[PDB]
Design a protein around this ligand. Structure first.
Ligand code: 35P
Length: 417
């Protein structure tokens, strides 16, 4: 502890972590704006473990002289870390989760840079010096959720990219339908008649999208999911638990039908899926917004020497092209429909074209979660949002979309400055 640890700063210059020298000789870790991006800034605690940047960039932040403790402070001084996080967007995301459990990720679609990353409930660093699904879980990257209908984005992308369907192709979308010996149902058993795929997607018909998933087959469904990041521990410089899909060979038709609507119901050796992180949902939206090119997200922009010189800069890196540019353009158009006339009207913001996909998924004892992935502006997107609002007793139907749209609009205004 005699070696001064480097600082952690936002892209807009807000210091979130500093080490301060003491007369004693040692350094104490200070956290200005304590409470901001806590899970991302992280900590090193005996009781609570290690997390975030303090942990992952520990060496950067962290010979004859080594044998002398009195000289530790002299030779080495840790380098600082500038994050991609913008403090104003981070504040926007934190304000939007007040009163709720869940998370939000805002990301640049062309690079995968994480501009805001918020999990709720959260905590302060002061609180770690006391006794405390807890606040410590990072719901953006280390909690897995059934994505529900937000995953239809992947089903749609795969259907179009394999040239098995088009947005104007019609589908029967009844209230209930037998598939693989089990029943699939639209929400509220709504019978929508025969409708084009773009409308089945905007209105989020499970019966229609399940039919597409069965037409694709398990290999295709899983393969496309993986091409968007499933099975990868996303993040160049932060830890994300991989999103999961089953071994396609173990899937049944009924399982496949539900999986295509974002509900993991499989029973077999491999995991049931899809199970997703919010960060993964953001990566999917970004890929779609970025002409199909998937980017490995990152949260460190650059590293600075104690003197203030740039030691290294992170380079954006692609995880591949999951779908063609033509496919991505069709998926974007379908997502515009979700917001302009479908289940995502709550995301609309006057004067800006926002596109996205909603989902709602049942969890334990009558609880359900609301999801939204989206991007803006529709034409030439410069931001992507991914949201989950956990209901845990409260009815949060459509909340993801409302939070998502509000966050995108506020972040676009910040970008314009
Ligand atoms: C996708 O998520 C869909 N979900 C369902 O039909 C199951 O939905 C619910 C579970 C619990 C409580 C209420 C609904 C279809 N898409 C949803 C969406 O948010 O887009 C939906 C509610 C419109 S139906």
């Amino acid at each position: 502890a005699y070696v001064q640890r480097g600082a952690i700063i936002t892209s807009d210059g807000v210091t979130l972590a500093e080490s301060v020298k003491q007369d004693d000789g040692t350094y104490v870790r200070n956290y200005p704006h304590d409470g901001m991006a806590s899970h991302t800034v992280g900590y090193i605690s005996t009781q609570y473990g290690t997390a975030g940047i303090e942990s992952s960039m520990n060496e950067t932040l962290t010979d004859w002289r080594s044998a002398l403790y009195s000289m530790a402070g002299i030779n080495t001084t840790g380098s600082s870390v500038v994050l991609t996080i913008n403090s104003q967007m981070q504040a926007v995301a934190e304000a939007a989760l007040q009163g709720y459990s869940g998370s939000i990720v805002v990301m640049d679609p062309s690079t995968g840079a994480v501009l805001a990353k918020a999990s709720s409930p959260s905590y302060t660093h002061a609180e770690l010096g006391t006794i405390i699904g807890s606040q410590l879980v990072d719901r953006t990257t280390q909690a897995l959720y059934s994505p529900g209908s937000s995953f239809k984005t992947v089903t749609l992308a795969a259907g179009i990219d394999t040239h098995k369907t088009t947005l104007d192709t019609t589908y029967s979308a009844p209230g209930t339908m037998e598939i693989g010996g089990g029943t699939i149902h639209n929400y509220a058993n709504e019978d929508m008649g025969t409708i084009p795929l773009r409308e089945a997607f905007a209105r989020s018909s499970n019966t229609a999208l399940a039919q597409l998933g069965v037409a694709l087959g398990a290999d295709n469904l899983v393969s496309y999911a993986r091409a968007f990041g499933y099975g990868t521990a996303l993040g160049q410089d932060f830890s994300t638990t991989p999103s999961l899909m089953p071994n396609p060979a173990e899937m049944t038709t009924w399982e496949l039908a539900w999986a295509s609507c974002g509900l993991p119901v499989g029973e077999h050796a491999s995991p049931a899926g899809p199970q997703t992180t919010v960060m993964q949902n953001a990566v999917i939206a970004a890929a779609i917004a970025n002409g199909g090119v998937v980017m490995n997200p990152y949260i460190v922009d650059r590293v600075l020497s104690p003197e203030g010189a740039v030691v290294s800069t992170t380079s954006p890196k692609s995880l591949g092209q999951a779908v063609s540019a033509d496919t991505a353009a069709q998926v974007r158009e379908a997502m515009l429909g979700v917001v302009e006339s479908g289940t995502g009207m709550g995301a609309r913001v006057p004067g800006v074209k926002i596109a996205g996909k909603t989902g709602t998924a049942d969890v334990e004892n009558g609880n359900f979660n609301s999801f939204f992935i989206g991007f803006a502006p529709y034409d030439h997107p410069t931001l992507v949002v991914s949201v989950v609002i956990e209901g845990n007793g409260e009815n949060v139907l459509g909340y993801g979309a409302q939070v998502g749209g509000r966050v995108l609009a506020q972040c676009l205004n910040i970008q314009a400055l």
